From a paper:
The outer capsid shell of the icosahedrally averaged PBCV-1 structure consists of the MCP (Vp54) and the penton protein. The minor capsid proteins (P2, P3, P4, P5, P6, P7, P8, P9, P10, P11, P12, P13, and P14) form a hexagonal network that is immediately below (inside) the outer capsid shell.
Here we have extended the resolution of the PBCV-1 structure to 3.5 Å by collecting data using a direct electron detector. This is by far the largest viral capsid structure that has been determined to near-atomic resolution, and the first near-atomic description of a NCLDV capsid. P2, P5, P6, P7, P8, P9, P12, P13, and P14 are present as a single copy in each icosahedral asymmetric unit, whereas the copy number per icosahedral asymmetric unit of P3, P4, P10, and P11 are three, four, two and 12, respectively. Three rows of P3 and three copies of P2 construct a scaffold that glues together all the capsomers in each trisymmetron. Neighboring symmetrons are bound together by the zip proteins (P11). The icosahedrally averaged near-atomic structure of PBCV-1 shows that the PBCV-1 capsid is stabilized by a dense array of minor capsid proteins (P2–P14) inside the major capsid shell. This minor capsid protein shell cements most of the gaps between neighboring capsomers and uses transmembrane helices to mediate inner viral membrane association.
Numbering used by the authors:
A (entry chain a4): 98 to 147, 152 to 254
B (entry chain a3): 218 to 288
C (entry chain c9): 5 to 170
D (entry chain f9): 4 to 437
E (entry chain l5): 136 to 193
F (entry chain g3): 3 to 49
G (entry chain d1): 3 to 436
H (entry chain j1): 341 to 436
Write the structure that this text describes.
């Protein structure tokens, strides 16, 4: 008899974007080192945190078993920016604020469609800076073939 | 750009050995600039399709023909 | 290390009338059994189909399966268990007034018949999952085996020329 | 359905990356230093019709490839009387290395080979080098060039390293036909005053510079080469009242690339089809003078399958069908479509065991040295069509042919296989005998 | 004896499945009688004390 | 059709199929020794 | 079935499938630099007309260039059969200049010779369709012709010319239009009254590179291994009725030469490389009462009938030494291209390759005439004794003779195709060797 | 299939067993568990003139002799398994 | 014409057949076509000369499930309460004037 | 007659469809046969009385692999870069004696197209991409009185 | 006037109970089987 | 003269329950079908007028 298999998540490797590394665009900046990028739509509630599983940084819990697929790829959180709990300009606020939703849908708020690794800067501090919740990648609108602006998850 | 972009490889009308017959390289198995009969992916041990450097899998070629390359 | 793969499997089936028997005050499960038997309420019947006896049987089926196989199984659906109990009950129900002796035999038959289906049931499921999960059976060249020619003509293939000795 | 699948929402965005290669800037490979020279060989024995002659290839260069046998013939009649006569003339050629036969071709093989594997302008140019194709008349004199088609005569990649064969000689033995149509005989009738052929054998030699020449001279070498296997047999001749059938043992060995065959009337070289009173199908066809017992020699070949004799065929291995029975037109038209890409004349058939039988690179073979019972099973067409009545021929059905098709009594079965020619310590021969 | 204990099998939690198939006991009689279950009398039909004695009573 | 025969199982069948011991859908051929048989002519003495 | 072949596995399979290296059931692909191609019209400086010299300059619209097609619009000055590749005849020559340096130059005759040797089958036919009238068009008919250029960058993406890297050098093309074109504005020596002047336009196919490739071209130095054509005209040692003329022609060539090519011709009639005769297609009106052997059937100027070719035999000498044994003209006409190209060469056109495959871009053996102080082409001509007006005299003739009209082939054209290096640096380009 | 002999015309067998001609049950149909079993028979058209060999012998699959109308009786038999039990000097069948 | 089938699974999603849960069993339909169809190939008992034969095609509407629903169907047992049609034909007593 | 198909997998071994890898999926070919075929059952618009109905057979050339490769295909995921044909029929902006018609045709295509190809035709006559004329080979009876 | 044959193919199927059906569906099997080998030959023709 | 073909890009957004469409003569409200001389299919349909 041959032993059955579970989710078996598919994870790619982070790439060199010039003086920094980041996860490729169809993927998310999941976990670290062994599992750096998620490819499939769900992944292994990575334990490393702060320590804590949420879920972690860029994915949110779903109502399932098989830890390997308990977080769904492509989300974040309200992430307070300046004085308002807005999603990043390139993110889509679902509307699931928290109070009007159950635990699973309350966490799945920003729908990071087409912006899983990089986003654009925001006119928040009056200076066009990297969103409060992300790392400040050195690229600009003049720089070609790199539409992402200061951002990384 | 930090990429070892090679020269072109077109279908030539003459077979050519790469002058490295004792170590059989894998980059010359898919190079159409030397062979002329047929083209196949290089099989590693236990009949595993080993993709040599420079070439790309069919899914990667589809991603490069639809979405685009990089810099 | 197999904990997760095992944990991953649901323990709660979205079954028609999940929690099918008991969990209702409209009428007892004993009565349902009596009605299909077409027998009067009586100590033999009210002990055999009682919740404590149904529970006894369910626990034995679970425990014995776990003892006999490597598998952990749930309680069985009770329409299936009631129908089986009543079927067995109709074809036997033989006692001289000794309810305890009668019950011992009837429980023996129910537990035994249930295990005759369960033990192979478990096997069938486990083998099913193998096939449902893994391509073809999850096996290798053993399954994808071409016939062996197995004839001797090839033994006579000879060299065309002999090298000089060196 | 409990297996794992992938949504692939952006699988391709994930799988992209940098360019690997650019189309607009070619790098040419630096090659070795060599030169090519065409050198005449000495032919021993008297050359003439029906004679057996031979030549030893002189050690003038290091490696050899192309070999062309020149012949000079004069037409013994007018245009329409000859058909590839220089091809017919070279009845056969045998390649011997170290005294061991490596290969051997026949005039009919050259005709079959050409009919099956050459094409387009190459085939035409070939015909120019072996026949008269511009309506030449009696007495016209031409030099013909018959290229040989041994493995080393097709590619430098298999150049024969004479330099590596210091103890062994390489020879060609050539049989010249006793008769050549339209040159010294018109059918069975000798042509009075016909001239004997002039013959010359040319070998194109490769001269290597020191580093490569030395490696060849000193190192052992293994060349993957192609050999012809061949034998003729009686055809289960079809007739007006019946569909003949025949179980033919295929006495072949080695990893075979393909089988090829034809039926023919041994009377007339290259005749693989029946004769008929339709244009080009017989001498005088289309006119009152038409005779369906003699071909229009200049137009002996045809693509009109109505004149072919194979209804269907299958090949069995170890007594079992290798593929489902297919019609003769499958072997004639489809196999070549798939495997060659040229056009094959009616009466010529192919069954490949290889993806690309026309090339050098192995692409699947049938090892007959491991097969106990290889049999070709043929079913012939009913010979009920009156060949002298075009309507009877042109309007016929799939399962029938010309009454004159029963003259195609000879069957030639050929096979090409891959062996290894090994050279070492100045000597060589085949890796395998069988 | 068939199926050699497969301790490496991961789905050992077969609780979500109902293996009992009570399809063979639908419509049976006391031992082997054939009367289409004979639900004729609209009453309770009490239990008959069938004691497993030999061919005779005593 | 045939499935209804499988379903129609009673007390009477216990002596035929309860606790199966055998099956009709599997045969076992028993491995035997190696031997060969030959027909040989004998010499007849007398007349 | 197929399994019966797979099971037939043994020792002779090891050299074909043991330790497999590739699988034919899986294609491997390469990520190529993204690009696009756009067709852009260039203008013409100078007045377009017969006998005029005009030119263009290729603008830097794209980064690299390859194919160039010159369009012409011509009318028929006579009926079908009066023209022969007239757009090819019209474009008398094209000179390629980079930075003012002459890089290369093609001639109308070269285009004809090139085609005769290297194009084939439907490539050749489709080519003819773009330069001639091949559907029996009549006087007054007008068509657009497309004459592709054959400079090294016009044959493969691999040699796309790096306009991008030539910041300070323009690429120009000078086109000479013939003063007369047969069947268009002249009929033999006679002008055609009312003939229209050609309309001309030069089209260039530009390659647009992505950012990364574009950058490399701008920053890196480049070199290309390219082809050049060397060409001179010579008088033919005209043969005659009583003799086989012979001639030693100095081969004033340099650089690594891939091959030589040559023909003999009648300067009056474009593409005429053979003698005229009263046999179908061999002369104007051939085969009938109106036949003349002073003018060709222009639409059938070319032929594969060698009997009308002038050359008997030839050899190439290097520094007075034979390079190969003397071979017959038919060897250069038929065998050389069989071996080296795989197409069919018309009578009167000859090839001698120094390369294994001269039809390709990859060098495969060259004769470097920069190291041969005195190369010579030695030609022997046939005796011009055959009366061209008597079909039998021609069709029934011998190997060493030709038509009396072969003495009209007074010109000899010798070409040599060689390899040089085009270097690009600091925004400028030019050849490495004189 | 089930016996290996030859059965005379007019006699029909349907087996529920692999080898009904033997002792080992080898498959049975328990009719005590079948609420309503039915044998459904279709008869031939009895239009053949029994007194005329041409009609008797040259006829079609779906027809028979006019005299077949006289075959008015049908006998249906079945063979089944019961258990003969013997105990304490007495015995009989387990199932009634 | 479109003849919908009216089997229990053809009436509601709630009784869809889980082909996914039937790895070792096939699901098949069998269709008997009438020898005669009124006004199409026959008019009462009379055949209609030249009548065309039908073109037939069976279309099945499939449900594609996402990851969790799909997985549960594949691994859990499934029970549906379904309908069946029982049928028998017979001669009527014949009434008369 | 033998009509080869030209789908991507029908052109090269490199794109052979891995039926062994399709444990649960079938591969089908649907073939529509023309209502009429010129010179076979119809002469222009006229049906040909007595014309035969076609006999058809579909042949597939299968590749049998050895054990290691059969297993590989059966177990591993496979991706093949393939070709597809997109096609739409349009009404031609038919030209006339006094005018050069012109037409803006929307190219309702998607994907990385390798090339476009097109033709104009007379739908009446299969394969007719050009006008008819009384010149040899350009019409029925061309070159003569008929 | 000869009629064409009407043909039908019938197969006798074995319906297994749950325990055995499962094993057949799930487990590997080995069956010793018989095969017929056959070739046709020309008979040397005997004569008077 | 032809079976017209069309490919209409649908510039829709949002989670769509269904699509619906019709062809019509914009002249006549609600006309989704062709006119004909059969009862109800045109003004005066079925008669000379």
């Amino acid at each position: 008899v041959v032993k059955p298999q579970g989710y078996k998540p598919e994870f790619v490797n982070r790439v060199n974007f010039g003086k920094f590394w980041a996860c490729p665009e169809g993927t998310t900046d999941w976990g670290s080192e062994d599992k750096q990028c998620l490819v499939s739509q769900y992944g292994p509630m990575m334990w490393r945190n702060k320590w804590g599983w949420s879920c972690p940084a860029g994915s949110a819990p779903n109502n399932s078993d098989d830890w390997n697929q308990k977080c769904v790829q492509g989300y974040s959180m309200k992430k307070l920016i300046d004085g308002q709990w807005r999603c990043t300009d390139t993110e889509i606020d679902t509307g699931k604020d928290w109070s009007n939703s159950d635990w699973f849908t309350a966490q799945q708020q920003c729908d990071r469609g087409n912006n899983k690794v990089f986003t654009r800067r925001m006119y928040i501090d009056g200076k066009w800076q990297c969103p409060d919740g992300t790392w400040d990648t050195g690229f600009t609108w003049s720089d070609g073939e790199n539409g992402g602006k200061q951002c990384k998850y | 750009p930090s990429y070892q972009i090679r020269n072109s490889k077109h279908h030539t009308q003459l077979p050519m050995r790469s002058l490295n017959e004792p170590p059989p390289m894998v980059e010359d198995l898919v190079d159409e600039s030397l062979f002329e009969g047929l083209q196949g992916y290089p099989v590693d041990e236990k009949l595993d399709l080993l993709t040599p450097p420079g070439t790309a899998t069919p899914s990667s070629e589809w991603a490069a023909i639809n979405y685009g390359l990089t810099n | 290390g197999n904990f997760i793969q095992n944990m991953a499997f649901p323990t709660e089936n979205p079954y028609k009338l999940s929690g099918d028997f008991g969990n209702s005050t409209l009428e007892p499960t004993v009565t349902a059994a009596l009605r299909i038997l077409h027998e009067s309420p009586a100590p033999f019947n009210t002990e055999f189909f009682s919740r404590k006896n149904v529970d006894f049987i369910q626990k034995k089926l679970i425990s014995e399966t776990k003892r006999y196989t490597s598998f952990d199984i749930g309680p069985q659906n009770e329409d299936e268990l009631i129908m089986m109990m009543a079927g067995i009950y109709v074809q036997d129900s033989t006692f001289d007034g000794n309810i305890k002796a009668g019950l011992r035999k009837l429980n023996t038959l129910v537990i035994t018949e249930c295990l005759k289906q369960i033990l192979p049931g478990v096997r069938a499921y486990a083998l099913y999952v193998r096939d449902a999960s893994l391509p073809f059976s999850g096996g290798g060249e053993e399954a994808f085996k071409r016939p062996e020619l197995a004839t001797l003509k090839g033994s006579k293939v000879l060299s065309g020329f002999l090298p000089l000795d060196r | 359905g409990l297996s794992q699948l992938v949504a692939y929402g952006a699988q391709d965005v994930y799988l992209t990356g940098n360019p690997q290669i650019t189309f607009f800037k070619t790098v040419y490979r630096r090659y070795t230093n060599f030169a090519i020279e065409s050198i005449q060989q000495t032919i021993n024995g008297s050359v003439g019709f029906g004679n057996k002659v031979s030549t030893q290839i002189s050690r003038n260069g290091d490696l050899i490839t192309d070999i062309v046998v020149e012949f000079v013939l004069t037409k013994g009649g007018n245009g329409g009387t000859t058909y590839y006569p220089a091809e017919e003339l070279l009845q056969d050629v045998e390649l011997e290395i170290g005294g061991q036969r490596i290969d051997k071709h026949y005039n009919d093989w050259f005709r079959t080979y050409d009919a099956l594997f050459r094409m387009n302008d190459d085939r035409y140019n070939y015909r120019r080098m072996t026949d008269w194709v511009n309506n030449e008349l009696v007495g016209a004199q031409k030099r013909f060039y018959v290229p040989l088609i041994f493995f080393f005569n097709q590619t430098p990649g298999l150049a024969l390293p004479l330099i590596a064969l210091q103890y062994h000689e390489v020879k060609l033995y050539f049989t010249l036909a006793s008769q050549v149509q339209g040159v010294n005989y018109n059918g069975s009738s000798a042509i009075a005053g016909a001239a004997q052929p002039t013959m010359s054998v040319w070998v194109d030699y490769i001269f290597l510079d020191t580093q490569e020449r030395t490696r060849f001279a000193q190192l052992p070498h293994e060349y993957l080469i192609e050999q012809l296997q061949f034998t003729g047999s009686e055809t289960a001749t079809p007739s007006a009242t019946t569909q003949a059938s025949q179980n033919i043992r295929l006495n072949f060995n080695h990893p075979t690339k393909y089988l090829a065959w034809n039926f023919n009337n041994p009377t007339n070289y290259g005749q693989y089809t029946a004769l008929a009173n339709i244009p080009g199908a017989c001498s005088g066809a289309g006119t009152a003078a038409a005779t369906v017992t003699t071909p229009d020699y200049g137009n002996t070949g045809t693509y009109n399958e109505q004149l072919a004799v194979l209804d269907s065929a299958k090949i069995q291995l170890n007594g079992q069908d290798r593929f489902a029975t297919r019609k003769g037109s499958y072997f004639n038209k489809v196999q070549p479509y798939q495997s060659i890409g040229g056009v094959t004349p009616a009466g010529v058939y192919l069954y490949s065991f290889a993806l690309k039988p026309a090339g050098r690179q192995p692409s699947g073979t049938c090892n007959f040295s491991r097969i106990d019972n290889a049999t070709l099973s043929l079913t012939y067409k009913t010979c009920s069509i009156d060949a002298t009545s075009p309507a009877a021929v042109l309007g016929n059905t799939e399962t029938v042919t010309a009454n004159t098709a029963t003259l195609l009594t000879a069957l030639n079965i050929y096979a090409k296989n891959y062996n290894v020619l090994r050279i070492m310590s100045g000597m060589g021969g085949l890796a395998y005998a069988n | 004896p068939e199926a050699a204990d497969f301790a490496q099998f991961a789905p050992k939690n077969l609780q979500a499945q109902n293996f009992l198939t009570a399809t063979q006991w639908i419509g049976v009689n006391t031992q082997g009688s054939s009367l289409k279950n004979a639900n004729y009398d609209l009453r309770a039909d009490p239990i008959i004390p069938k004691a497993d004695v030999g061919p005779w009573m005593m | 059709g045939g499935l209804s025969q499988l379903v129609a199982y009673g007390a009477q069948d216990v002596y035929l199929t309860g606790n199966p011991q055998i099956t009709f859908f599997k045969t076992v051929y028993r491995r035997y020794t190696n031997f060969a048989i030959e027909s040989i002519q004998q010499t007849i003495n007398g007349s």
